[PDB]
Amino acid sequence: CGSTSNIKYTVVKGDTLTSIAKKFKSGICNIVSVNKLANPNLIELGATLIIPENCSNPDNKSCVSTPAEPTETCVPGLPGSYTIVSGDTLTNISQDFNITLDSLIAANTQIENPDAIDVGQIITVPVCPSSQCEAVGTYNIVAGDLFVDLAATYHTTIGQIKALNNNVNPSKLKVGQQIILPQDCKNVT
Amino acid sequence: CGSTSNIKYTVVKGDTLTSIAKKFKSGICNIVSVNKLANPNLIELGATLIIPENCSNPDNKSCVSTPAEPTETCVPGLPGSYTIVSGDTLTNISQDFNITLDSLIAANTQIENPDAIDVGQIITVPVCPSSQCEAVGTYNIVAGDLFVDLAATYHTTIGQIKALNNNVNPSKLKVGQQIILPQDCKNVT
Ligand SMILES: CC(=O)N[C@@H]1[C@@H](O)[C@H](O[C@@H]2O[C@H](CO)[C@@H](O[C@@H]3O[C@H](CO)[C@@H](O[C@@H]4O[C@H](CO)[C@@H](O)[C@H](O)[C@H]4NC(C)=O)[C@H](O)[C@H]3NC(C)=O)[C@H](O)[C@H]2NC(C)=O)[C@@H](CO)O[C@@H]1O
Ligand SMILES: CC(=O)N[C@@H]1[C@@H](O)[C@H](O[C@@H]2O[C@H](CO)[C@@H](O[C@@H]3O[C@H](CO)[C@@H](O[C@@H]4O[C@H](CO)[C@@H](O)[C@H](O)[C@H]4NC(C)=O)[C@H](O)[C@H]3NC(C)=O)[C@H](O)[C@H]2NC(C)=O)[C@@H](CO)O[C@@H]1O
Ligand SMILES: *[C@@H]1O[C@H](CO)[C@@H](O[C@@H]2O[C@H](CO)[C@@H](O)[C@H](O)[C@H]2NC(C)=O)[C@H](O)[C@H]1NC(C)=O
Ligand SMILES: *[C@@H]1O[C@H](CO)[C@@H](O[C@@H]2O[C@H](CO)[C@@H](O)[C@H](O)[C@H]2NC(C)=O)[C@H](O)[C@H]1NC(C)=O
Ligand SMILES: *[C@@H]1O[C@H](CO)[C@@H](O)[C@H](O)[C@H]1NC(C)=O
Ligand SMILES: *[C@@H]1O[C@H](CO)[C@@H](O)[C@H](O)[C@H]1NC(C)=O
């Protein structure tokens, strides 16, 4: 990393390796390597990490697949709606659904100002015509499970998992917890 | 019906043939018969119906399958949560999910008083362990479609359709409207 110092750092609410790497001018993959993290997406609240700070040569690419900006304008299969929770923004919710912000705003012409939404407000999610998810049902959380990773494994999205578990905080999942998991969401015909 | 008079009546918000029959001391099936209604569950806002009033011999049974009080304590497959809309009560939401009121309250110990819920509040829906719906996706509304009837045809519940379309008023469905429809919800294994 060619860091100028190492700090031991305590992981707090809202942290990701991306946010940590940016705060300390480090690299995602250097933090992974130095701490022997099995999964760059998983860091536990209250854990200590060694962070190489102010790196001349940060690596943010080798260990992670950085997904591009969403380009789709609809979500396959479900849901028709999503309920706003504390901290949500239309930007982040569109990202979670892998759709453009523009498409989500367009689906919600009842919203007067897209930056003024309220906890408990229901928004429409634009669903692709002729689309479905194949088998939506119970799943028990195992150690290290994350919505981001389940979405990839099961061919869905973070947003779709959130909508089906809309009062579940993704950062507070417990081993054995039952969630509802959609699978294999796609256009058909 | 052995009515003592007939009134022409205009269907308004919240009406069902059950509520009309009770207001006018008529019978569901007599109103069906006299008005040549194809589907006892379907009466259109603003329609006129002939109602035989104050019947000595009301028929509320021959044309309808009156379902009993729910006895199940969980819903198969989905959803993890439901968002309260105007007019909702935990009694009616449990009925829509075909579960006991008791089970829904038990799933929601965060609610201090079950009679004081707010529009926009998110409640947990108790989902049966080891259960799924088979193919959740888009459906276009055709003339005369109702959530009550789609639930029966597709082996789901009114509540599950509502949760997947939580800002859709079931009384305001339009021909061609895309909704999200779960199917074949059951325990598995
Ligand atoms: C490389 C990069 O920046 N990737 C990000 C990616 O990290 C984002 O995903 C979010 O990551 C955070 C951090 O890992 C997730 O929060 C963690 O969630 C898990 C599960 O709830 C928590 O684990 C629990 O931890 C406690 C101890 O604290 C243990 O007792 C529990 O057993 C344990 N549970 C399990 C099942 O193992 C962990 O504490 C949380 N950490 C923090 C800092 O909150 C968050 O869930 C995750 N978000 C989603 C939606 O999956 C991702 C966000 O989109 O972007 C990148 O891909
Ligand atoms: C026997 C008995 O009491 N059964 C009840 C059952 O009626 C309950 O179900 C509710 O029924 C009401 C009344 O039929 C449903 O509301 C109607 O909904 C339809 C669809 O949205 C409306 O149709 C539209 O009408 C306008 C004109 O007004 C037309 O322009 C549209 O084309 C037309 N749309 C379609 C697709 O045809 C109709 O106006 C509504 N009527 C009223 C009075 O609101 C209501 O949706 C339905 N509820 C559900 C959840 O399905 C049922 C409730 O659980 O209990 C019994 O089984
Ligand atoms: C978000 O959507 C994009 C666009 O559909 C997805 O990227 C495409 O995935 C398909 C299916 O495997 C590939 O054929 C394309 O080549 C992918 N890239 C692009 C630029 O279109 C991407 O998978 C989705 N991201 C997430 C996180 O779900
Ligand atoms: C509500 O739940 C009850 C109980 O599961 C359902 O009634 C049963 O349906 C099964 C499956 O066909 C039958 O084998 C039972 O005989 C039924 N009756 C009883 C008393 O258990 C009923 O189908 C559900 N109602 C709705 C509207 O979904
Ligand atoms: C699914 O179909 C919709 C509707 O035509 C289209 O907009 C969308 O891009 C399709 N999705 C994919 C991944 O091809
Ligand atoms: C589904 O399984 C659950 C969990 O055991 C049980 O409570 C429920 O009654 C089952 N449903 C049916 C319809 O048999």
Residue numbers in the entry:
A (entry chain A), B (entry chain A): 7 to 195
Can you provide the manuscript's text about this entry?
The leaf mold fungus Cladosporium fulvum abundantly secretes the LysM-containing effector protein Ecp6 during colonization of its host tomato. Ecp6 acts as a scavenger of chitin fragments and thus prevents recognition of the fungus by host immune receptors. The three LysMs of Ecp6 (LysM1–LysM3) share the typical βααβ-fold, with LysM1 being separated by a long and flexible linker from a compact and rigid body formed by LysM2 and LysM3. The composite LysM1–LysM3 binding site shows ultra-high chitin-binding affinity, thus explaining how LysM effectors outcompete plant host receptors for chitin binding.
The structure was determined by single-wavelength anomalous dispersion (SAD) and refined to a resolution of 1.6 Å with an Rwork and Rfree of 20.3% and 22.5%, respectively. The structure model comprises nearly the complete mature protein sequence, from amino acid residues 7 to 195. Ecp6 has a tightly packed structure that is stabilized by four disulfide bridges, and two spatially close glycosylation sites (Asn104 and Asn193) were identified. Unexpectedly, the calculated 2Fo−Fc map showed a well-defined electron density for a bound chitin tetramer (GlcNAc)4 in a large interdomain groove between LysM1 and LysM3 (∼16 Å long and ∼11 Å across its widest points), although the protein crystallized in the absence of exogenously added chitin. The chitin oligomer was likely co-purified with Ecp6 and derived from the cell wall of the P. pastoris expression system. Evidently, LysM1 and LysM3 of Ecp6 cooperate to bring two chitin-binding regions together, composing a novel type of binding groove in which one chitin tetramer is nearly completely buried and engaged in many noncovalent interactions, including 12 hydrogen bonds. Specifically, the groove is shaped by the amino acids 20GDTLT24 and 46PNLIEL51 of LysM1 and 150GDLFV154 and 176PSKL179 of LysM3. Furthermore, the solute-exposed ends of the chitin tetramer in the structure suggest that longer oligomers can also be bound to the groove, in which case four GlcNAc units of a chitin oligomer make direct contact with the protein while the remaining parts of the molecule protrude into the solvent.
